[PDB]
Amino acid sequence: GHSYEKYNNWETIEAWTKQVTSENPDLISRTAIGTTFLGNNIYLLKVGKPGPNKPAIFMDCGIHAREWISHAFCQWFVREAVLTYGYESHMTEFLNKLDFYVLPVLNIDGYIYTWTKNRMWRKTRSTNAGTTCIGTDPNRNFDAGWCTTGASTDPCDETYCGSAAESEKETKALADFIRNNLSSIKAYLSIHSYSQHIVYPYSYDYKLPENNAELNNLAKAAVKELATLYGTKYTYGPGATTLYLAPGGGDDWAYDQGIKYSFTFELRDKGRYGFILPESQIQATCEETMLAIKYVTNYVLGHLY
Numbered sequence: 097g098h099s100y101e102k103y104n105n106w107e108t109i110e111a112w113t114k115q116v117t118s119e120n121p122d123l124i125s126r127t128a129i130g131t132t133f134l135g136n137n138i139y140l141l142k143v144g145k146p147g148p149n150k151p152a153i154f155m156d157c158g159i160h161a162r163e164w165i166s167h168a169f170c171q172w173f174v175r176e177a178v179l180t181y182g183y184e185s186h187m188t189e190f191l192n193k194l195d196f197y198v199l200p201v202l203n204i205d206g207y208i209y210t211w212t213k214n215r216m217w218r219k220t221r222s223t224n225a226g227t228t229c230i231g232t233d234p235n236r237n238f239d240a241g242w243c244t245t246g247a248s249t250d251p252c253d254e255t256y257c258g259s260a261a262e263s264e265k266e267t268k269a270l271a272d273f274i275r276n277n278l279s280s281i282k283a284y285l286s287i288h289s290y291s292q293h294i295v296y297p298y299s300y301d302y303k304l305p306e307n308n309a310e311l312n313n314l315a316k317a318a319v320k321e322l323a324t325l326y327g328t329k330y331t332y333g334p335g336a337t338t339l340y341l342a343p344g345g346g347d348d349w350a351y352d353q354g355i356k357y358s359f360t361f362e363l364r365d366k367g368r369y370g371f372i373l374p375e376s377q378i379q380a381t382c383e384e385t386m387l388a389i390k391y392v393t394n395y396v397l398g399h400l401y
């Protein structure tokens with residue numbers, strides 16, 4: 097049984113994507129955009145009222161395996177879209193004027209592995225020449241300052257950059273889709289955990305984006321919004337300046353393709369529970385996070401380009 101208030105295994109998520117599609121065929125369609133290293137189909141949900149020449153927002157969750165609240169947040173947002181379309185002003189406006197490409201789990205092989213073998217797995221589950229060490233960090237795998245400081249050339253390491261930018265079938269699939277749909281995609285959002293942080297470019301070097309100011313004011317305002325449900329406290333900023341150098345990120349790759357609004361959400365908590373966030377925090381984290389998401393999507397709508 098699927099539940100939006102529990103963490104579901106991959107078999108549960110896969111069946112849910114087939115089902116939420118067939119049950120809401122006018123709001124949602126589903127493609128496979130690639131296959132994983134282990135041959136799993138990477139489903140993508142095109143969410144929105146079918147209409148011609150629509151701009152789009154891309155979102156991904158599940159890039160990293162152990163960050164379970166993130167996978168639960170993609171399903172939640174799809175949940176909000178289906179339940180509140182026709183019932184809430186803003187959501188409704190958003191689905192008529194925009195399509196949402198929601199990739200609920202990028203790193204499907206890593207996720208299965210956190211359910212079967214190791215709860216604290218992050219990377220993919222591809223093999224590496226010369227070692228029996230497994231996995232590439234997808235969010236060091238993108239062609240954007242690829243494999244510079246903050247990424248590791250060691251395969252045994254948790255930030256390993258891969259053998260080439262886009263070496264992971266999963267990264268390649270997600271970058272191929274986005275190049276294939278570049279002229280419609282107006283924003284890029286990537287959901288992660290933990291640390292209650294909203295980051296924007298750049299993470300691959302210490303530099304600030306052309307619209308730093310606008311992204312500063314926009315991150316300030318979504319943190320502020322998010323903070324109005326339960327008063328949860330989020331910090332924000334440019335990635336290199338806020339967290340650490342983290343090159344080969346999808347957020348930077350997308351921005352350098354000309355997707356001007358690009359954000360990484362690092363959800364609950366600050367460390368009490370970490371990656372192992374009680375299922376009893378799903379509902380609240382997603383609800384407070386949805387307010388930040390819609391807040392960004394309403395900005396974008398007002399600032400098309």
Ligand SMILES: NCCCC[C@H](NC(=O)N[C@H](CC1CCCCC1)C(=O)N[C@H]1C[C@H]2CC[C@@H]1C2)C(=O)O
Pocket residue numbers: 160218235236254255288289290291295299335339342345346347348360
């Ligand atoms: N693309 C721009 C933003 C990228 C930032 C993103 N952050 C991210 O993954 N953070 C988590 C979450 C926790 C980890 C404990 C401290 C609090 C946060 C994590 O597991 N990071 C790993 C990276 C190294 C530093 C810690 C490990 C090794 C990333 O590293 O790709």
Ligand SMILES: [Zn+2]
Pocket residue numbers: 159160163287288289
């Ligand atoms: Zn992450």
Ligand SMILES: [Zn+2]
Pocket residue numbers: 176383
């Ligand atoms: Zn809700």
Ligand SMILES: [Zn+2]
Pocket residue numbers: 399
């Ligand atoms: Zn304006």
